[PDB]
CSV table of C-alpha atoms and ligand atoms in Angstrom, one decimal:
chain,number,residue,atom,x,y,z
A,1,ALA,CA,106.6,84.0,95.0
A,2,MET,CA,104.8,86.7,97.1
A,3,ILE,CA,103.6,85.4,100.5
A,4,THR,CA,99.7,85.9,100.6
A,5,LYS,CA,98.9,84.1,103.9
A,6,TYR,CA,99.5,84.6,107.6
A,7,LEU,CA,102.3,82.1,108.7
A,8,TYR,CA,100.6,80.7,111.8
A,9,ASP,CA,97.7,78.2,112.2
A,10,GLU,CA,94.3,80.0,111.7
A,11,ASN,CA,92.5,77.4,114.0
A,12,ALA,CA,94.6,78.8,117.0
A,13,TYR,CA,94.3,82.6,116.4
A,14,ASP,CA,93.3,84.8,119.4
A,15,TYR,CA,89.8,85.7,118.0
A,16,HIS,CA,88.6,82.1,118.4
A,17,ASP,CA,88.8,82.4,122.3
A,18,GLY,CA,85.5,82.8,124.1
A,19,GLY,CA,86.9,85.8,126.1
A,20,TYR,CA,88.2,87.6,123.0
A,21,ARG,CA,87.7,91.4,122.8
A,22,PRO,CA,87.8,92.9,119.2
A,23,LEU,CA,89.4,96.3,118.6
A,24,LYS,CA,87.0,99.2,118.5
A,25,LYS,CA,87.3,102.8,117.3
A,26,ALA,CA,89.1,105.1,119.9
A,27,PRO,CA,87.4,108.5,120.4
A,28,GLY,CA,89.2,111.7,119.2
A,29,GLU,CA,90.4,113.3,115.9
A,30,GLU,CA,93.3,111.5,114.1
A,31,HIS,CA,96.8,112.5,115.3
A,32,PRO,CA,100.2,112.4,113.7
A,33,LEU,CA,102.0,109.1,114.8
A,34,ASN,CA,104.2,109.8,117.8
A,35,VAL,CA,107.9,109.2,116.9
A,36,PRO,CA,110.1,109.3,120.0
A,37,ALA,CA,113.4,111.3,119.6
A,38,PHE,CA,116.7,109.4,120.1
A,39,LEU,CA,118.1,109.3,123.6
A,40,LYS,CA,121.1,111.8,123.7
A,41,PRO,CA,124.3,110.4,125.3
A,42,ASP,CA,125.4,111.9,128.6
A,43,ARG,CA,129.0,111.4,127.6
A,44,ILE,CA,130.9,110.1,124.4
A,45,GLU,CA,134.6,108.9,124.8
A,46,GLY,CA,135.9,107.0,121.8
A,47,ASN,CA,134.1,103.6,121.8
A,48,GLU,CA,132.6,104.4,125.3
A,49,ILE,CA,129.0,105.9,125.3
A,50,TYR,CA,127.1,106.9,128.5
A,51,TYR,CA,123.3,106.8,128.8
A,52,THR,CA,120.8,107.5,131.6
A,53,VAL,CA,117.3,105.8,131.5
A,54,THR,CA,114.7,106.7,134.1
A,55,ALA,CA,111.4,104.8,134.7
A,56,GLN,CA,108.9,107.5,135.8
A,57,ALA,CA,105.2,108.4,136.2
A,58,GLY,CA,103.6,111.2,134.2
A,59,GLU,CA,100.4,112.2,132.3
A,60,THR,CA,99.8,111.5,128.6
A,61,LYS,CA,97.1,113.1,126.5
A,62,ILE,CA,95.6,110.0,124.7
A,63,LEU,CA,91.8,110.4,124.7
A,64,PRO,CA,89.7,113.7,124.6
A,65,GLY,CA,89.3,115.3,128.1
A,66,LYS,CA,91.4,114.2,131.1
A,67,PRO,CA,95.1,113.1,130.5
A,68,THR,CA,95.9,109.4,131.2
A,69,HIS,CA,98.2,108.6,134.2
A,70,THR,CA,101.0,106.6,132.6
A,71,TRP,CA,104.5,105.2,133.1
A,72,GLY,CA,107.4,105.8,130.6
A,73,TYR,CA,111.2,105.9,130.2
A,74,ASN,CA,112.5,109.6,130.3
A,75,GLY,CA,108.9,110.7,129.8
A,76,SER,CA,105.2,110.0,130.6
A,77,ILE,CA,104.7,106.9,128.3
A,78,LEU,CA,106.8,104.3,126.4
A,79,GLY,CA,110.4,105.8,125.9
A,80,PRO,CA,112.9,107.4,123.6
A,81,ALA,CA,114.5,105.5,120.8
A,82,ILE,CA,117.9,104.1,122.1
A,83,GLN,CA,120.7,103.6,119.5
A,84,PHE,CA,123.4,101.0,120.1
A,85,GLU,CA,126.3,100.5,117.6
A,86,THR,CA,127.9,97.0,117.2
A,87,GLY,CA,131.4,97.0,118.7
A,88,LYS,CA,130.8,100.0,121.1
A,89,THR,CA,130.7,99.8,124.9
A,90,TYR,CA,127.7,101.3,126.7
A,91,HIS,CA,127.6,102.6,130.3
A,92,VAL,CA,123.9,102.8,131.3
A,93,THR,CA,122.6,104.3,134.6
A,94,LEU,CA,119.2,102.7,135.2
A,95,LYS,CA,117.0,104.9,137.5
A,96,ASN,CA,113.7,104.0,139.1
A,97,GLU,CA,111.5,107.1,139.8
A,98,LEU,CA,108.4,104.8,140.5
A,99,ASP,CA,107.0,103.8,143.9
A,100,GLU,CA,107.6,100.0,143.2
A,101,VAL,CA,110.6,97.8,142.2
A,102,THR,CA,111.3,97.6,138.5
A,103,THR,CA,113.7,95.9,136.2
A,104,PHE,CA,115.3,96.9,132.9
A,105,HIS,CA,115.3,94.0,130.3
A,106,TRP,CA,117.0,94.6,126.9
A,107,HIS,CA,114.8,92.1,124.9
A,108,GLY,CA,117.0,90.7,122.1
A,109,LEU,CA,120.4,92.0,123.4
A,110,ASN,CA,123.3,89.5,123.8
A,111,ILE,CA,124.5,90.5,127.3
A,112,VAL,CA,125.6,88.7,130.5
A,113,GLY,CA,122.9,87.7,133.0
A,114,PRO,CA,121.2,87.7,135.3
A,115,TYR,CA,122.1,91.3,136.4
A,116,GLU,CA,123.1,93.2,133.3
A,117,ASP,CA,120.3,91.2,131.4
A,118,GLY,CA,117.8,93.0,133.7
A,119,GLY,CA,115.6,90.0,134.5
A,120,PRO,CA,113.9,89.3,137.9
A,121,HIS,CA,117.3,89.0,139.6
A,122,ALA,CA,118.1,92.7,138.7
A,123,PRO,CA,115.7,94.8,140.8
A,124,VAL,CA,116.1,98.6,140.8
A,125,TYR,CA,114.4,99.9,143.9
A,126,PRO,CA,112.2,103.0,144.1
A,127,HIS,CA,114.3,106.2,144.0
A,128,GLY,CA,117.4,104.0,143.6
A,129,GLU,CA,119.7,103.2,140.6
A,130,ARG,CA,121.8,100.5,139.0
A,131,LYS,CA,124.7,100.9,136.6
A,132,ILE,CA,125.5,98.4,133.8
A,133,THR,CA,128.4,98.2,131.3
A,134,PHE,CA,128.3,96.0,128.1
A,135,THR,CA,129.9,95.8,124.7
A,136,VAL,CA,127.4,95.2,121.8
A,137,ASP,CA,128.5,92.1,119.7
A,138,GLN,CA,125.6,91.2,117.4
A,139,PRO,CA,124.4,92.4,114.0
A,140,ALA,CA,122.1,95.4,113.3
A,141,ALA,CA,118.6,94.7,114.7
A,142,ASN,CA,115.3,96.1,116.1
A,143,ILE,CA,115.2,95.1,119.8
A,144,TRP,CA,113.4,96.8,122.7
A,145,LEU,CA,113.5,97.7,126.5
A,146,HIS,CA,110.8,96.7,129.0
A,147,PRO,CA,110.5,95.7,132.7
A,148,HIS,CA,110.9,92.1,133.9
A,149,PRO,CA,110.0,92.1,137.7
A,150,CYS,CA,108.4,88.7,138.6
A,151,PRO,CA,105.4,88.6,138.6
A,152,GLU,CA,104.5,92.3,138.0
A,153,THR,CA,105.8,92.4,134.3
A,154,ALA,CA,102.4,92.4,132.5
A,155,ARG,CA,101.1,95.3,134.7
A,156,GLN,CA,104.3,97.4,134.3
A,157,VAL,CA,104.2,97.0,130.5
A,158,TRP,CA,100.4,97.8,130.6
A,159,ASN,CA,101.1,101.0,132.5
A,160,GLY,CA,103.3,102.2,129.6
A,161,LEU,CA,107.0,101.1,130.1
A,162,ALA,CA,108.5,100.0,126.7
A,163,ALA,CA,111.2,101.7,124.5
A,164,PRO,CA,112.2,100.9,120.9
A,165,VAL,CA,116.0,100.1,120.8
A,166,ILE,CA,117.9,100.0,117.5
A,167,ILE,CA,121.3,98.2,117.0
A,168,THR,CA,123.1,99.5,113.9
A,169,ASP,CA,126.3,98.3,112.1
A,170,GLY,CA,128.4,99.0,109.0
A,171,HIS,CA,126.7,96.4,106.8
A,172,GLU,CA,123.1,97.8,107.5
A,173,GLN,CA,124.5,101.4,106.9
A,174,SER,CA,126.0,100.3,103.5
A,175,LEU,CA,122.5,99.4,102.2
A,176,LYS,CA,121.4,103.2,102.2
A,177,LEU,CA,117.9,102.3,103.5
A,178,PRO,CA,115.2,104.9,104.3
A,179,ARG,CA,116.8,106.4,107.5
A,180,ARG,CA,115.3,109.9,108.2
A,181,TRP,CA,113.7,109.2,111.6
A,182,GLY,CA,110.0,110.2,111.6
A,183,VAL,CA,110.1,111.1,107.9
A,184,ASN,CA,110.7,107.8,106.0
A,185,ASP,CA,111.8,105.6,109.0
A,186,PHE,CA,109.4,104.8,111.8
A,187,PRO,CA,109.2,102.6,114.9
A,188,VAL,CA,105.8,101.0,115.1
A,189,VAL,CA,105.2,99.8,118.6
A,190,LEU,CA,101.8,98.0,118.5
A,191,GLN,CA,99.9,97.8,121.8
A,192,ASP,CA,96.2,97.6,122.9
A,193,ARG,CA,94.6,99.2,126.0
A,194,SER,CA,91.3,99.8,127.7
A,195,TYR,CA,90.5,103.1,129.6
A,196,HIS,CA,88.1,103.9,132.5
A,197,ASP,CA,87.4,107.7,132.7
A,198,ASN,CA,90.6,107.9,130.4
A,199,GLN,CA,92.7,106.0,133.1
A,200,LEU,CA,94.5,102.6,132.9
A,201,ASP,CA,93.1,99.9,135.3
A,202,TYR,CA,95.1,96.7,134.7
A,203,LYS,CA,93.4,94.9,137.7
A,204,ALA,CA,89.9,95.6,136.3
A,205,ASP,CA,90.8,94.4,132.7
A,206,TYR,CA,93.1,91.6,133.8
A,207,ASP,CA,92.7,88.1,132.2
A,208,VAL,CA,94.8,85.1,133.3
A,209,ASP,CA,95.0,83.9,129.7
A,210,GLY,CA,96.3,87.3,128.4
A,211,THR,CA,94.9,90.8,128.8
A,212,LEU,CA,93.3,92.4,125.7
A,213,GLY,CA,92.7,96.2,125.3
A,214,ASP,CA,89.8,97.8,123.4
A,215,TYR,CA,91.8,100.5,121.7
A,216,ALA,CA,94.8,100.2,119.4
A,217,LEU,CA,97.7,102.2,120.9
A,218,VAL,CA,100.6,102.8,118.4
A,219,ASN,CA,103.7,104.5,119.9
A,220,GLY,CA,101.4,105.7,122.7
A,221,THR,CA,98.9,107.4,120.3
A,222,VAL,CA,95.4,106.5,119.2
A,223,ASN,CA,94.1,107.0,115.6
A,224,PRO,CA,97.7,107.5,114.2
A,225,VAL,CA,98.5,109.3,110.8
A,226,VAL,CA,101.7,109.1,108.8
A,227,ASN,CA,102.2,111.9,106.2
A,228,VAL,CA,104.1,110.2,103.3
A,229,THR,CA,106.6,112.8,102.1
A,230,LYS,CA,109.0,110.3,100.5
A,231,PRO,CA,107.5,107.2,98.7
A,232,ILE,CA,109.9,104.5,100.1
A,233,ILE,CA,109.2,104.1,103.9
A,234,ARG,CA,110.7,101.8,106.6
A,235,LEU,CA,108.3,100.5,109.3
A,236,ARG,CA,109.9,98.7,112.3
A,237,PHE,CA,106.9,96.7,113.6
A,238,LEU,CA,107.0,95.4,117.2
A,239,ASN,CA,104.2,93.5,118.8
A,240,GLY,CA,104.4,95.2,122.3
A,241,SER,CA,101.0,93.7,123.4
A,242,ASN,CA,100.4,91.7,126.6
A,243,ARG,CA,98.7,88.9,124.4
A,244,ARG,CA,97.0,90.3,121.2
A,245,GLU,CA,98.2,89.1,117.8
A,246,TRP,CA,98.5,91.6,114.9
A,247,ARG,CA,97.5,90.5,111.4
A,248,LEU,CA,98.9,93.4,109.4
A,249,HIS,CA,97.9,94.3,105.8
A,250,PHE,CA,97.0,97.4,103.8
A,251,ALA,CA,93.2,97.6,103.1
A,252,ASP,CA,93.9,97.1,99.3
A,253,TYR,CA,96.6,94.4,100.1
A,254,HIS,CA,99.4,96.6,98.7
A,255,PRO,CA,102.6,94.5,98.8
A,256,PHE,CA,105.5,95.2,101.1
A,257,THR,CA,109.0,93.8,101.7
A,258,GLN,CA,110.2,92.3,105.0
A,259,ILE,CA,114.0,93.0,105.3
A,260,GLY,CA,114.5,92.0,109.0
A,261,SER,CA,113.4,89.7,111.9
A,262,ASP,CA,114.0,90.0,115.7
A,263,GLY,CA,117.8,89.5,115.5
A,264,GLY,CA,118.6,91.5,112.3
A,265,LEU,CA,118.5,91.7,108.5
A,266,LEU,CA,117.2,88.5,106.7
A,267,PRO,CA,119.5,86.7,104.3
A,268,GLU,CA,117.0,87.6,101.5
A,269,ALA,CA,114.2,90.2,101.3
A,270,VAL,CA,110.8,88.6,101.4
A,271,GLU,CA,107.8,90.1,99.5
A,272,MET,CA,104.3,89.7,101.1
A,273,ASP,CA,100.9,91.4,101.2
A,274,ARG,CA,100.2,90.5,104.9
A,275,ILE,CA,102.1,89.5,108.0
A,276,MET,CA,101.2,88.1,111.5
A,277,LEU,CA,103.2,89.0,114.6
A,278,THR,CA,102.9,87.2,118.0
A,279,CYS,CA,104.0,88.9,121.3
A,280,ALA,CA,107.5,90.4,121.2
A,281,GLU,CA,108.1,89.5,117.5
A,282,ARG,CA,109.6,92.3,115.3
A,283,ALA,CA,109.3,92.7,111.5
A,284,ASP,CA,111.4,95.4,109.7
A,285,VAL,CA,109.5,96.1,106.4
A,286,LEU,CA,109.9,98.5,103.4
A,287,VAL,CA,106.8,99.9,101.6
A,288,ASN,CA,106.9,101.7,98.2
A,289,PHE,CA,104.0,104.2,98.0
A,290,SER,CA,105.1,105.3,94.5
A,291,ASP,CA,102.0,103.8,92.7
A,292,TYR,CA,99.6,106.0,94.8
A,293,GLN,CA,98.5,109.6,93.7
A,294,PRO,CA,99.5,112.7,95.7
A,295,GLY,CA,96.1,113.1,97.4
A,296,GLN,CA,95.2,109.5,98.3
A,297,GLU,CA,94.9,107.9,101.8
A,298,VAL,CA,96.2,104.3,102.3
A,299,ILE,CA,95.0,102.5,105.5
A,300,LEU,CA,97.1,99.8,107.2
A,301,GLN,CA,94.8,97.4,109.0
A,302,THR,CA,95.0,94.6,111.5
A,303,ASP,CA,92.3,92.0,110.5
A,304,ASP,CA,89.3,94.3,109.5
A,305,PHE,CA,90.4,97.1,111.8
A,306,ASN,CA,91.8,100.5,110.6
A,307,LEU,CA,95.2,100.9,112.4
A,308,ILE,CA,97.4,103.5,110.7
A,309,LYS,CA,96.3,106.0,108.0
A,310,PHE,CA,99.1,106.9,105.4
A,311,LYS,CA,98.4,110.2,103.7
A,312,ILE,CA,100.2,110.4,100.3
A,313,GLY,CA,101.8,113.9,99.9
A,314,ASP,CA,103.5,115.4,96.8
A,315,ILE,CA,105.7,112.3,96.4
A,316,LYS,CA,108.1,111.8,93.4
A,317,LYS,CA,107.9,108.2,92.2
A,318,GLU,CA,110.9,106.0,92.9
A,319,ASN,CA,112.1,102.4,92.3
A,320,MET,CA,112.9,100.2,95.4
A,321,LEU,CA,115.8,97.8,94.6
A,322,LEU,CA,117.5,95.8,97.3
A,323,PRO,CA,120.6,93.6,96.9
A,324,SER,CA,120.5,89.8,96.8
A,325,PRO,CA,121.8,88.5,99.0
A,326,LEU,CA,120.5,91.1,101.6
A,327,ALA,CA,122.9,89.9,104.4
A,328,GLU,CA,125.1,87.0,105.3
A,329,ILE,CA,123.9,84.8,108.2
A,330,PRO,CA,126.6,82.5,109.5
A,331,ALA,CA,125.1,79.0,109.7
A,332,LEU,CA,125.4,77.3,113.2
A,333,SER,CA,127.0,73.9,112.4
A,334,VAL,CA,125.0,70.9,113.7
A,335,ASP,CA,125.6,67.1,113.6
A,336,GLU,CA,124.2,63.8,115.1
A,337,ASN,CA,126.2,64.5,118.4
A,338,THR,CA,124.8,68.1,118.9
A,339,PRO,CA,123.1,68.0,122.3
A,340,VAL,CA,119.3,68.2,122.2
A,341,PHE,CA,117.2,70.0,124.9
A,342,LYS,CA,113.4,69.3,124.9
A,343,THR,CA,111.1,72.0,126.4
A,344,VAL,CA,107.3,71.6,126.5
A,345,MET,CA,104.7,74.4,126.8
A,346,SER,CA,101.3,73.0,128.1
A,347,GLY,CA,98.0,74.3,129.3
A,348,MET,CA,96.2,77.6,129.1
A,349,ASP,CA,94.8,80.2,131.7
A,350,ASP,CA,96.0,79.5,135.3
A,351,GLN,CA,97.2,75.9,134.2
A,352,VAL,CA,100.1,77.1,132.0
A,353,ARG,CA,103.3,75.1,132.7
A,354,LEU,CA,106.9,75.0,131.2
A,355,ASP,CA,108.1,71.3,131.4
A,356,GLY,CA,105.3,70.7,133.9
A,357,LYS,CA,106.6,73.4,136.3
A,358,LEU,CA,106.0,77.0,137.4
A,359,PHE,CA,109.0,79.5,137.6
A,360,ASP,CA,111.2,79.4,140.8
A,361,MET,CA,113.8,82.2,141.1
A,362,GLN,CA,116.2,79.8,143.0
A,363,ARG,CA,115.8,76.8,140.6
A,364,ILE,CA,118.1,76.3,137.6
A,365,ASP,CA,116.1,74.1,135.1
A,366,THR,CA,118.8,73.4,132.5
A,367,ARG,CA,122.6,73.9,132.2
A,368,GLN,CA,124.3,74.4,128.7
A,369,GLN,CA,127.9,75.1,127.8
A,370,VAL,CA,129.0,78.5,126.5
A,371,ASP,CA,130.1,78.6,122.8
A,372,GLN,CA,128.7,75.0,122.1
A,373,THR,CA,125.8,74.9,119.6
A,374,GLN,CA,122.7,73.4,121.1
A,375,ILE,CA,119.4,72.0,119.5
A,376,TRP,CA,116.2,72.9,121.3
A,377,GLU,CA,112.9,71.2,120.6
A,378,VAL,CA,110.1,73.6,121.7
A,379,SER,CA,106.6,72.0,121.9
A,380,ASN,CA,103.1,73.3,122.4
A,381,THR,CA,100.8,70.5,123.6
A,382,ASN,CA,97.6,72.6,123.4
A,383,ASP,CA,94.8,70.9,121.3
A,384,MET,CA,94.5,72.2,117.7
A,385,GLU,CA,90.8,72.9,118.7
A,386,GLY,CA,90.5,75.5,121.5
A,387,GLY,CA,94.3,75.9,121.5
A,388,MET,CA,96.6,78.9,121.6
A,389,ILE,CA,99.8,80.1,119.8
A,390,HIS,CA,102.4,80.6,122.6
A,391,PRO,CA,105.2,83.0,121.6
A,392,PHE,CA,108.4,81.3,123.0
A,393,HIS,CA,111.4,83.6,123.9
A,394,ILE,CA,115.0,82.9,125.1
A,395,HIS,CA,117.1,85.6,126.8
A,396,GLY,CA,120.8,86.3,126.1
A,397,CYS,CA,120.9,85.0,122.5
A,398,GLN,CA,119.6,85.0,118.9
A,399,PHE,CA,118.8,81.6,117.4
A,400,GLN,CA,118.1,80.0,114.0
A,401,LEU,CA,115.1,77.7,113.2
A,402,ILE,CA,115.8,74.2,111.8
A,403,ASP,CA,112.2,73.0,111.1
A,404,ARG,CA,108.5,73.3,112.1
A,405,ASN,CA,107.0,69.8,112.8
A,406,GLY,CA,109.8,68.3,110.6
A,407,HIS,CA,108.6,70.5,107.6
A,408,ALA,CA,110.1,73.7,106.0
A,409,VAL,CA,110.3,76.8,108.2
A,410,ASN,CA,108.3,80.0,107.4
A,411,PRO,CA,109.8,82.1,104.5
A,412,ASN,CA,110.6,85.0,106.9
A,413,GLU,CA,112.3,82.6,109.5
A,414,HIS,CA,115.7,82.0,107.8
A,415,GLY,CA,117.5,84.7,109.8
A,416,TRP,CA,118.1,85.5,113.5
A,417,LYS,CA,115.1,85.1,115.9
A,418,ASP,CA,114.7,85.4,119.7
A,419,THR,CA,110.8,84.9,119.8
A,420,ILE,CA,108.8,82.2,117.8
A,421,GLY,CA,105.1,81.5,117.8
A,422,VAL,CA,104.6,77.8,118.6
A,423,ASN,CA,101.2,76.5,117.2
A,424,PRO,CA,99.1,74.0,119.1
A,425,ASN,CA,100.4,70.4,118.5
A,426,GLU,CA,103.7,71.8,117.0
A,427,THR,CA,107.4,71.0,117.8
A,428,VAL,CA,109.7,73.8,116.5
A,429,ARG,CA,113.4,72.7,116.3
A,430,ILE,CA,115.9,75.5,116.7
A,431,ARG,CA,119.7,75.8,117.1
A,432,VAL,CA,121.4,78.2,119.4
A,433,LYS,CA,125.0,79.1,120.5
A,434,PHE,CA,125.0,81.0,123.8
A,435,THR,CA,128.1,83.4,123.7
A,436,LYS,CA,127.5,85.0,127.2
A,437,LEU,CA,127.9,83.4,130.7
A,438,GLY,CA,125.1,83.8,133.2
A,439,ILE,CA,121.6,82.8,134.2
A,440,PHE,CA,119.0,83.5,131.5
A,441,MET,CA,115.1,83.1,131.3
A,442,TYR,CA,113.2,81.2,128.7
A,443,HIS,CA,109.4,81.6,128.7
A,444,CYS,CA,106.1,82.3,126.9
A,445,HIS,CA,105.9,86.1,126.0
A,446,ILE,CA,102.2,86.3,126.7
A,447,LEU,CA,103.0,88.5,129.7
A,448,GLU,CA,100.1,87.0,132.0
A,449,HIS,CA,101.4,83.4,131.2
A,450,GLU,CA,105.0,84.6,132.1
A,451,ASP,CA,103.7,86.2,135.4
A,452,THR,CA,101.7,83.0,136.3
A,453,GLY,CA,105.1,81.2,136.0
A,454,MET,CA,105.3,79.8,132.4
A,455,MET,CA,109.1,80.6,132.6
A,456,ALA,CA,112.3,78.7,133.5
A,457,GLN,CA,116.0,79.5,134.0
A,458,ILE,CA,119.1,78.3,132.1
A,459,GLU,CA,122.7,78.5,133.3
A,460,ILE,CA,125.3,79.1,130.5
A,461,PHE,CA,128.6,77.8,132.0
A,462,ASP,CA,132.3,77.7,131.2
A,463,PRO,CA,133.7,74.4,132.6
A,464,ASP,CA,137.2,76.1,133.1
A,465,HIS,CA,135.8,79.4,134.5
A,466,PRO,CA,133.0,78.3,137.0
A,467,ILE,CA,130.7,80.8,138.8
A,468,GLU,CA,128.7,80.4,142.0
A,469,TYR,CA,125.3,82.2,141.7
A,470,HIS,CA,123.5,83.5,144.8
A,471,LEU,CA,119.7,83.5,143.8
A,472,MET,CA,117.1,84.9,146.2
B,1,CU,CU1,110.6,90.7,126.2
B,2,CU,CU1,113.9,88.9,126.6
B,3,CU,CU1,101.8,81.2,126.8
B,4,CU,CU1,111.9,87.5,129.5
């Protein structure tokens, strides 16, 4: 059965809000979609790989006329693609070339916190640096890098800091997926921005309930085009927006196949003709353009807005056959004695709260034991009328969903997730086993809600290896 509906509650979508800004056509001729080159290692020594990542200011040609003053990693905007391999050890030098404190958060990476995790306790000062070391121990996945300085996160992402990060492993490699980067394999970082004389002005456009931008910005480009040379194409979608939801479908509702979620390959491929992504959610999809003619143009839309133009070249038709099962996901074993943690998202605008509280850097809100599976019950108490879908995210883990309001979970939610849209009046039940010690954040990933303080801290502890944390 092909999925032919968006898998969140229509009553709560972003376009119902009184302050909603619809997308409008960005000026300029259409450009090829920007595909960032992979970051080259500084040094490769067996299982040890060395990287340098620098947050820096630059100028990006986005709109006709004056370039836009932007922030990027190793460049003017966004960042390079960063490859991690499961089992390998990474030595990363994190450099801040900006005039303000920043932070380097690997969203979706299983890593120790709060320092290596790169949350608000891991500042990198202007013209200073921080070194981290970590071994990757999680399956192949589409994750990302972005700043996490409390409470400047929304503005720093707005200014352009985000990088697509790809974990690869032997199993994913064995599938022989489309993997020519920028030919038949594309990162699709979806963002939205407003410009004033071609310049960013976050303060001018700021909205407490989540800042929307007038123009669709895909991988830091406006009016993007993909030239389809090979008919089977991989699109790694990331909702990199401050608040906006993306309701993705081709203008003719051409079907596509989701093969992956936040934390990796799904157990089974899922066919669909549309998909909705809340903030920080990823969807790895395959599209077969074989049934189009070598002159046609196929437009990917969000709602009724033209987002990416696919121009069909001299393609040779090809069958797309995936294995069943697609990947094995080890079930987290749960019983009646599994501890249950209840966390409640409430309010909107300036009145957002997590369990009735605003974030405090020195306050640990919950304590859970390492390597012991936990049930979380995640609630959104917003009214179904006037309410809001809050994308709930946990650091330092991937989790599995049990149920949505005691009913079956969405057909693309049977794998690893680190971010879930919680509908108004919904309780989502999830199970998670934290494998890394440290302090980790959990919060709404609407970045203005996060910055207001819709965020809390969890200590993952070992009762036979205790740690004293010194939080400022
Ligand atoms: Cu994030
Ligand atoms: Cu995160
Ligand atoms: Cu929120
Ligand atoms: Cu976070």
